[PDB]
Write a protein that binds this DNA or RNA. Structure first.
Ligand SMILES: [Zn+2]
Lengths: 48, 56, 338, 103, 495, 96, 49
DNA sequence: GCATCCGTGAGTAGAGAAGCACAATTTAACACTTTTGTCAAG
DNA sequence: CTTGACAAAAGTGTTAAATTGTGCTATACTGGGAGCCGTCACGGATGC
């Protein structure tokens, strides 16, 4: 929604943001027709 | 009067980088440093060792 | 002020010139126009090139920090004029100096404009310098008589210079502006169709939205043209040890096999031509170019042996027939053509 | 100090982290241990050299022993450059070959 | 004969031009449609050679016996296409650029010769500080300027152009001082502001004009208006006082009177000497004069101080802003002149004297300089060759642009590095031709130096140059030769 | 790579092995005749298919690339003879 | 994380289109260009280690 | 003497986001003789 | 062996459309952007 703070008018529409790759049942992706796995990454946890 | 000198000891890396032939020194490490000093001095590699002749 | 960051260094330098007030802007703009008119008045009287005086006047304003003999000679020639004429030289000097200060005080305008064109193939400093070229042209074409602010007119020239430079310098293989804007329009049209369709538009759908004179064939050809070249140093794999150039074979230099079969063909042809006569073999060698490398026309061949054009055709064709007979009996040249 | 790193620092003529202390001249060592610090004096005919060894220094020489120039007063890896200036080219070459062989 | 020795030495600008078969003037590589090399580009056949053996670009010649012939139409030599692996081009730089190897390879060879530190060399080469070549009798802070002295931008502007500052006034007030009043430090120009420098104070834009006719009349001056007469001028009835775009707004005098300017927009205090004149002027705005130089009255009026002349056509006076014609320059061009004027034989003698100094550190430092000095003397190399005037261009076959079997083109990073240099060098030539201000020229020259550095050694100084759409640094000439993936260890020591 | 029908990599350590063996001519073939001596590799193949022994090898093309790339760095690299006279390894193809 | 990066790039392009003006007939579809978000997502699933 | 930032180096294979106006230059479609190429005459 | 004869094949001079290069838009707009640091020891210089 686009809001005009001065006028006070709201314009609402659904915009197409693209395509989200979908994970298959077994837990992989098909990227450009090729099966791919996103490997989990380990790193230092945030904090103090 | 003869030149008075004292012996020096350097590691293999420093000894290899101070060789007369600039081709073998440049092909080892510090290529920018080796070529910079060789070009200014106008060094002439006499192709004594093996690496120089391999390159050519 | 930054030894490392050039952008920060440039911003510091342009920050040392204060922004012009409206009164200061009008005064400088008036001087540039009066100086330009004064140079025109000087040239009509002194008789030399109007642009020649501008270079000489600008050289004095720029100073020794920026041919030297002819500039000084023209400078003395201008000063030899009477009092009324030397007045025009005075406005010319002040007009050129006002132009220098007017450009310097608007270097903040170009940076604000240029930062909106980043990520289009040119670095930020490249955008600023191109915008500076547009700013310089804006000063020359600006008219203060119209009472408009300088930034209103200058923004048009700063945007144009940056836009032109992107269309001319952002691609390794340069594409003309008329085709760059075609590519930009096609990309915009495809983007707008995607949001309406919820998917990648087809070439027919893009062509229909472009308008008359556009079909799917033209859209595909334009998109093929817009393809940027790929780097030979693009890494392959997780380690920077394999690159695209390592997998591209050279197809220009003949291979050792190709070079060898060329030599074998030459030695077989030279033995096949040995069975011919002396002049008869030389005719084929000169006709086909086996000596010089170019086909020699019948008239050129005829001049060498002192014969008419149709004479060669008799000996050239009869030599051809006998080589066919020899080949059928020996079978030594068939495999060299497949 | 052990294995491949020991070989590398010998071939690179690198100064050891826990370098030993060698006598610069020959003479007779004279130990003076106190509750505060340690100081070893190599007394000669007319020379009195000084070395301020730390408290936790494993000395390999006792009082009265005659030491040569370049001999290690304390245990540990000898700095090859110090040995060169103390005893000469032949000593350091002999030292380098033996130490590399030990590994 | 048999190859027995390989010699490496610096290449002079003359030697680089002797290598090149032509100057690469355009950043173009190939036509996008015909896929043929563009003229004067990085792949031009007239410079580097024909694409295919014994065939010119236009196609007039297609025979081997034309070997050694240059086509009159296309200008391409009829020879083997393999010359495109060997024939080099060159780029004629608008301004000299330093070779980054002789700048950043610690210790700097240029800095060692010139007795400049790494920081000092960086400031001069990349246009942060000026280095003095000829003081021309300049004095800074009471100390005369010396050769090789480093000047900041502010210090250079004070010496080159003078010292001045404008003091804005609060809206609606009047200045206490009058036009052309010799104010001093701390003297109040207006109730709310004081002059931070001593000099001559002059009104910039008088908002109100008071004419006392021979009865005062207060007018208003619009921001688009300009007063044509000075303060105290004798204006005859009807003469123009304040100019305007439209003649209706023109403020002409009703009768004869004296103009009194009031309500200045700001006061400009400039450290200048004013010489009133009555006759014509022998100089003009921008001229530089020394003490004793005649200014306007054919000898009667002469300058008594160093400065730059600005003639005033309304105040009828000549103001000489106290400044010096100091020759201080930035960039590699300043560094090149220092190495050109450096006498190696004299420097060697001076360094030998410093070798006798009892300090070990000074002897060690002098030995480092003498080793570089003796290297130039023994080899015959000329120290200013470390600054490039002509940039060699690698043969196109060693930086190929090839069409892959798929149809897309593949090219080396050097072409992008070369195009950036050509674009910046060509733009500097146009900026210089247009008489652009020094700030624009300085930025372009600094960009030119960085473009040269990226071509030779990308990432050595500053942020590495990357192609748009990726963070991958472009592979420079240094990167091609050095490292495990470099030419030595990947293609020469093993194959 | 097998997919590109490529040759085997004869790296520095393999070069070291031939040097330690004293196999100078075996080393020189791999450096020139079998890798990048364009004239040599063409003449080697032609000689072998004729039943002849391969000719004397010539300068590798990678050294020519090295010299040209060094010139691109504004470095004057020249091959000299016994008498210090310049020797052209480019067959007169790069001399104006 | 890569979705957020692309969305931040998309948000930046929305601001500049808001700076351009033409607010009389500005719609959210016109302000939003999804390509920066699609490119970041495509880059993650194709060229990420 | 010492402390610090910079620059150097760290195994080998293989296998993988502007638009328009107008001028200026180039391309391509024409016509044209011009020149081969040739097929019959002695 | 010449010498005519042909129909191309090739060269060539115009002319047109297609392509390419250049200039110009007048409310006012005047200092950026992305990073953002888990390795190690080694010289070598460069100044406190
Ligand atoms: Zn031609």
């Amino acid at each position: 929604q686009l809001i005009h703070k001065d006028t006070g008018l709201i314009k609402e529409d659904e915009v197409f943001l693209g395509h989200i790759p979908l994970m298959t049942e077994d837990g992989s992706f098909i990227i450009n027709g090729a099966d791919r796995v996103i490997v989990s990454q380990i790193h230092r946890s945030p904090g103090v | 009067t003869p030149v008075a000198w004292k012996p020096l000891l350097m590691g293999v890396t420093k000894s290899a980088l101070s060789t007369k032939s600039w081709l073998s020194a440049a092909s080892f490490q510090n290529t920018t440093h080796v070529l910079t000093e060789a070009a200014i001095a106008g060094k002439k590699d006499e192709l004594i060792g093996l690496k120089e002749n391999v390159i050519l | 002020i930054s030894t490392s960051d050039p952008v920060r260094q440039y911003l510091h330098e342009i920050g040392q010139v204060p922004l012009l007030t409206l009164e200061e802007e009008v005064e400088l703009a008036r001087k540039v126009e009066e100086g330009m008119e004064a140079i025109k008045k000087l040239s009509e009287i002194t008789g030399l090139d109007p642009d020649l005086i501008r270079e000489v006047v600008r050289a004095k304003i720029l100073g020794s920090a920026r041919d030297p003999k002819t500039v000084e000679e023209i400078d003395q020639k201008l000063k030899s004029l009477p009092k009324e004429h030397k007045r025009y030289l005075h406005i010319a000097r002040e007009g050129e100096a006002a132009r220098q200060h007017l450009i310097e005080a608007n270097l903040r305008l170009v940076v604000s404009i240029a930062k909106k064109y980043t990520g289009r193939g040119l670095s930020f400093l490249d955008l600023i310098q191109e915008g500076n070229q547009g700013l310089i042209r804006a000063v020359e074409k600006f008219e203060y008589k119209r009472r408009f602010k300088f930034s209103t007119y200058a923004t048009w020239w700063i945007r144009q210079a940056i836009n032109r430079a992107i269309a001319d310098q952002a691609r390794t293989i340069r594409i003309p502006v008329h085709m760059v804007e075609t590519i930009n329009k096609l990309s915009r049209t495809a983007r707008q169709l995607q949001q309406e369709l919820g998917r990648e538009p087809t070439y027919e759908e893009i062509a229909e939205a472009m308008g008359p004179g556009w079909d799917a064939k033209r859209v595909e050809e334009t998109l093929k043209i817009a393809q940027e070249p790929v780097s030979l140093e693009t890494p392959i794999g997780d380690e920077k040890d394999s690159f695209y150039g390592d997998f591209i074979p050279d197809e220009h230099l003949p291979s050792p096999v190709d070079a060898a079969t060329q030599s074998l063909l030459s030695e077989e042809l030279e033995k096949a031509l040995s069975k011919l006569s002396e002049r008869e073999a030389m005719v084929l060698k000169l006709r086909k170019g086996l000596i010089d490398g170019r086909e020699h026309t019948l008239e050129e061949v005829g001049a060498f042996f002192g014969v008419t054009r149709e004479r060669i055709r008799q000996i050239e064709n009869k030599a051809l027939r006998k080589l066919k007979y020899h080949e059928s009996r020996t079978r030594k040249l068939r495999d060299f053509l497949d | 100090t052990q294995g491949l790193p020991r070989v590398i620092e010998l071939f690179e003529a690198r100064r050891p982290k826990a370098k030993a202390v060698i006598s610069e001249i020959d003479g007779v060592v004279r130990i003076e241990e106190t509750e505060e610090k340690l100081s070893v004096f190599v007394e000669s005919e007319g020379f009195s050299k000084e070395y301020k060894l730390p408290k936790e220094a494993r000395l390999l020489v006792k009082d009265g022993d005659y030491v040569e120039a370049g001999q290690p007063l304390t245990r540990g890896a000898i700095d090859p450059h110090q040995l060169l200036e103390a005893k000469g080219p032949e000593a350091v070459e002999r030292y380098l070959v033996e130490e590399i062989q030990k590994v | 004969k048999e190859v027995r020795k390989v010699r490496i030495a610096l290449a002079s600008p003359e030697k680089i031009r002797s290598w090149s078969y032509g100057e690469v003037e355009k950043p173009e590589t190939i036509n996008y449609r015909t896929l043929k090399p563009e003229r004067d580009g990085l792949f031009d056949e007239r410079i580097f050679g024909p694409i295919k053996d014994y065939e010119c670009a236009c196609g007039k010649y297609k025979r081997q016996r034309f070997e050694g012939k240059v086509c009159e139409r296309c200008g391409v030599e009829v020879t083997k296409s393999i010359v495109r692996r060997y024939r080099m081009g060159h780029i004629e730089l608008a301004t000299p650029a330093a070779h980054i190897w002789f700048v950043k390879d610690v210790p700097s060879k240029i800095g060692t010769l010139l007795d400049l530190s790494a920081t000092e060399l960086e400031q001069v080469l990349y246009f942060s500080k000026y280095i003095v070549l000829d003081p021309k009798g300049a004095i800074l802070n009471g100390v005369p300027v010396e050769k090789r002295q480093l000047l900041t931008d502010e210090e250079y502007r004070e010496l080159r152009y003078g010292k001045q500052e404008t003091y804005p006034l609060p809206p609606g007030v009047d200045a206490l001082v009058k036009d052309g009043e010799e104010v001093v430090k701390g003297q109040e120009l207006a109730p709310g502001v004081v002059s931070r420098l001593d000099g001559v104070a002059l009104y910039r834009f008088p908002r109100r004009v008071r004419v006392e006719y021979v009865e005062p009349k207060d007018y208003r001056v619009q921001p688009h208006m300009n007063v044509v007469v000075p303060e105290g001028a004798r204006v005859e009835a009807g003469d123009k006082i304040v100019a305007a775009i439209d003649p209706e707004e023109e403020v002409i005098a009703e009768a004869e009177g004296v103009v009194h300017l009031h309500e200045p927009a700001s006061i400009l205090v400039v450290k200048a000497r004013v010489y009133p004149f009555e006759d014509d002027v022998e100089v003009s705005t921008g001229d530089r004069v020394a003490p004793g130089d005649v200014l306007a009255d054919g000898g009667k009026v002469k300058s008594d101080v160093y400065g730059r002349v600005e003639v005033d056509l309304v105040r009828n006076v000549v103001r000489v802003v106290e400044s010096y014609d100091i020759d201080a320059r930035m960039g590699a061009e300043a560094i090149q002149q220092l190495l050109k004027e450096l006498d190696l034989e004299a420097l060697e003698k001076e360094l030998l004297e410093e070798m006798k100094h009892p300090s070990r550190a000074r002897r060690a430092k002098a030995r480092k300089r003498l080793e570089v000095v003796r290297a130039f003397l023994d080899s015959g190399n000329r120290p200013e060759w470390m600054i490039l005037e002509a940039v060699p261009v690698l043969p196109p076959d060693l930086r190929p642009m090839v069409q892959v079997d798929g149809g897309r083109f593949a090219t080396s990073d050097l072409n992008d590095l070369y195009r950036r240099l050509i674009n910046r060098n060509n733009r500097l030539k146009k900026l210089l031709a247009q008489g652009a201000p020094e700030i624009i020229i300085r930025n372009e020259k600094r960009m030119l130096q960085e473009a040269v550095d990226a071509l030779l050694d990308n990432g050595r100084r500053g942020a590495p140059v990357t192609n748009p759409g990726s963070d991958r640094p472009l592979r420079s000439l240094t990167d091609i030769l050095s490292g495990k993936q470099g030419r030595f260890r990947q293609n020469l020591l093993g194959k | 790579g097998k997919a590109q029908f490529g040759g085997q990599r004869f790296g520095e350590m393999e070069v070291w092995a031939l040097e330690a063996y004293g196999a100078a001519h075996t080393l020189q073939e791999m450096l020139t005749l079998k890798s990048d001596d364009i004239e040599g590799r063409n003449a080697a193949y032609e000689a072998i298919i004729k039943g002849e022994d391969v000719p004397e090898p010539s300068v590798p093309e990678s050294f020519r690339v090295l010299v040209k790339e060094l010139q691109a760095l504004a470095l004057d690299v020249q091959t000299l003879d016994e008498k210090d006279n310049p020797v052209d390894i480019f067959e007169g193809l790069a001399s104006k | 994380d890569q979705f957020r990066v692309g969305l931040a790039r998309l948000a930046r392009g929305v601001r500049e289109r808001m700076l351009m003006g033409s607010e009389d007939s500005l719609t959210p579809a016109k302000l939003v260009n999804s390509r920066p978000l699609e490119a970041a997502i495509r880059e993650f699933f194709s060229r990420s280690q």
